[PDB]
Structure formats: C-alpha cells, structure tokens
Design a protein around this ligand. Structure first.
Ligand SMILES: Nc1n[nH]c(N2CCC(N(CCc3ccc(Cl)cc3)Cc3ccccc3)CC2)n1
Length: 377
C-alpha cells in the first residue's frame, strides 16, 4: 500500500500553532511525500516561493532519516491557471523543453519524481485539444524518465498525476486508459464534491450518494469517482484514493434548518488560522465549542453545525470507513490533502499528532514495526 501525502509551501505563512514547515514533517508518516507546488517559466519547471530552495533541502533531507521514503514535486495547482500548460504542450519543442527541464530540476534538488496538477486540461479555459496533448505530455515524460534511468543508471523518476473526480472534467481532459499506462500512480482528488458555491449544504467528500439524489448529482461521491476511474481503465493498484484533512463550510439561510441539502446563503465564516471562507482545516472543526456533530447516514461522513454555520468534514471514523472501502476495491492506497491541515502538532483536537493521517497509516497496515511514538485511533 501507498500513503501519499501533500506538503504545501504556503503553510509556512499561517500564524501561531498553525504554522507548518518541513521540521513538522514526520519522515515515517507517509510512503510518498509530494511538494505542492512548483510553477513554470518559459516552459521550464520553476520554484514558486522565495525560499523553496531552502525547503527542498529540508524536505528531501527527510530521506536521510527514512531512506525508503519517496518524494515528488507537484506542478500546477488551482491558482496556476491553464495557459502555461496549454502553451507548453502546444508543440513538440515546448514539451521537450519542459521535459528536459523537469529531469534536470528534479535531479538537482533530489526529488524522486514529478506529480502533474493541471486544473484541468480541456476545462477552465483550456481548449479541447489539450485532452490529447495532455496524453502526449504524460507519454513524453514517461518515455524520457525511462531513458534517463537507462543512460544514468539511476533509479527511474516517478510520474504521477492528480486527477478530478467529476465526470465533466474527466471527459473533457483525460484519456484515462492511455494515461494510466504511463503514470506510476493516479492521485484521485476525491473531495471538493460540494461546497459554498452551491445553494444548499452538501458534503466535501461523501463516500456514497444520498438516497434523494439523482442525475449527475448521484455521481458526486467517492465510490462513483473511484468506479469511474477504474471502469475507464485505471488499474486498481495504480489508483490512489484522495482523503481530505479539511472540510467545507456554509452559512445557513436559517439556523433552524441544518440538514444536508438545507438552503445556504454563501460560504461559512473563515477559520481563525486558514482564513479562507468556505474552507476549514480539521484542526479548526475538531474542537468547535458548543457545536452539534451529526453523521450523514447514507454517505458515511460527519457534519457539524453551530448557529448558522454548517461544515462537512472528515473524521477518524470516516477515514477508517474510506480505507476499508479502498481495500475492498483493491486500490493502491490513500492520498491526503494535506499534512498541514491535519492536527499535525496535536494542538487542537486532543487526539495526538496527525490523528487523521496516522489513522490512514494504521488502517493501511503501514505503521512501521519499529515505531515508538505512534498513536492508534
Ligand atoms: N492531489 C491533489 N492535487 N491538488 C489537490 N486538490 C486539493 C484540494 C484543493 N481544493 C481545496 C484546497 C484547500 C483546502 C483547505 C483549505 Cl482551509 C483551503 C484550501 C482547492 C480549493 C477549492 C475551492 C476553494 C479553494 C480552494 C484542490 C486541489 N489534490
């Protein structure tokens, strides 16, 4: 099994106990650590934060303590846009420029691979031709990584991609059966299914549909997303199920209607640390005073409300349920967004350090046998 965990290079700017750096990283927590995010300059892989080079050394230095650990660098993300990807994949020359830059960059900074996080080929302004061009990019990278291993004698660089769960995005951008052959693993973004952009409350990451749902809405859940990627040709062993250590919040139209599907007027109040309306870290929801926690029986996930605030999130129990699910489907493991959104320092939830991600590790049977300081949940 794999446990793929994302580090984010902006978590260093959060205040107080929520501030996260590589020193808060546990080298033996995950099997693969992915660094979000790199960018692109003149079709070449580039840093995005002023101290990335410092952080790269600390991040990849974790392998000195756990030599089994693999690291990857993720390019793109949700604020990156699409135009730079579009321009880079548009010609063989630009793809070659990018591919060679990626090999050089990853080797220089001691990363073991590249994770592609384009949001998304064929959507969000990216033209329809980018679907086939993304396939070509994936093939170009896989082939060039293979060749570099042959010629250098080094362990081959890994290639992964973070891919969407929603059928509209999948069909617009992803030749699933083709790319799955060339990717080492596929990081399924099984979250952001619902959120404050919608007029009624809904859960960030429900495992199954609600009985009431129909049409396209009935596929906005983890099980449907997993089955979608499997049926479209991803080998189960390559499919890695995303797990969110965050939730999505709503302001209710009325404090007297707190159901799933209740009317909402907009985003929930921003959290005290993450400061982004509509989103909360697990550590911002786990210890919410005077709130009422509920479970969505059909969907196997919790929500919590207080006054006119409603948040759908994941807890230890839902993570256990989802790992049981992925094992039943024979998936290659779990992926988690993100290290800095779990209670990484144990400052909030009274469940020790990394309660959610330790739960993943435990349920995947990945607890190091020589481990001393882990906490079972
Ligand atoms: N593997 C992987 N690669 N990329 C991803 N996902 C992780 C979840 C991201 N998704 C949530 C990121 C996010 C999570 C928690 C918080 Cl407090 C703030 C931001 C993007 C998002 C959507 C709506 C509003 C703001 C931002 C979207 C990218 N997963």
């Amino acid at each position: 099994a794999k446990l793929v965990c994302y580090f984010t290079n902006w978590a260093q700017y959060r205040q107080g106990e929520a501030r996260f750096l590589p020193k808060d990283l546990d080298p033996s927590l995950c099997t693969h650590l992915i660094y979000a995010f790199a960018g692109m300059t003149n079709h070449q892989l580039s840093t995005t934060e002023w101290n990335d080079e410092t952080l790269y050394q600390e991040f990849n230095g974790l392998k000195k303590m756990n030599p089994k650990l693999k690291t990857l660098l993720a390019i793109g993300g949700w604020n990156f846009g699409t135009q730079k990807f579009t321009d880079m994949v548009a010609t063989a020359n630009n793809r070659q420029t990018f591919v060679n830059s990626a090999i050089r960059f990853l080797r220089k900074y001691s990363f073991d691979g590249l994770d592609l996080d384009w949001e998304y080929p064929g959507s969000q302004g990216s033209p329809a031709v980018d679907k086939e061009r993304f396939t070509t990019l994936v093939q170009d990278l896989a082939n060039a990584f293979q060749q570099e291993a042959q010629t250098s004698g080094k362990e081959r660089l890994l290639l992964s991609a973070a891919v969407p769960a929603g059928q509209t995005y999948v069909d617009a951008g992803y030749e699933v059966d083709k790319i799955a052959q060339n990717l080492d693993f596929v990081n399924l973004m099984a979250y952001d299914f619902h959120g404050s952009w919608e007029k009624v409350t809904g859960h960030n990451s429900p495992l199954y549909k609600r009985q009431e749902e129909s049409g396209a809405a009935a596929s906005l859940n983890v099980d449907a997303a997993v089955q979608q990627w499997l049926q479209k040709g991803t080998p189960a062993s390559k499919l890695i199920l995303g797990m969110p250590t965050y939730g999505r919040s709503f302001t209710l139209a009325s404090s007297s209607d707190t159901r799933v599907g209740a009317p909402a007027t907009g985003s929930g109040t921003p959290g005290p640390f993450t400061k982004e309306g509509g989103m909360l870290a697990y550590y911002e929801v786990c210890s919410w005073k005077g709130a009422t926690k509920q479970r969505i029986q059909d969907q196997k996930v919790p929500y919590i409300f207080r006054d006119n605030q409603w948040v759908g999130f994941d807890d230890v129990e839902s993570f256990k349920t989802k790992v049981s699910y992925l094992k039943q489907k024979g998936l290659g493991g779990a992926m988690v967004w993100a290290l800095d959104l779990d209670d990484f320092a144990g400052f909030s939830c009274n469940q020790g350090r990394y309660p959610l991600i330790q739960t993943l590790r435990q349920e995947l049977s990945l607890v190091p046998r020589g481990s001393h300081h882990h906490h079972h949940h």
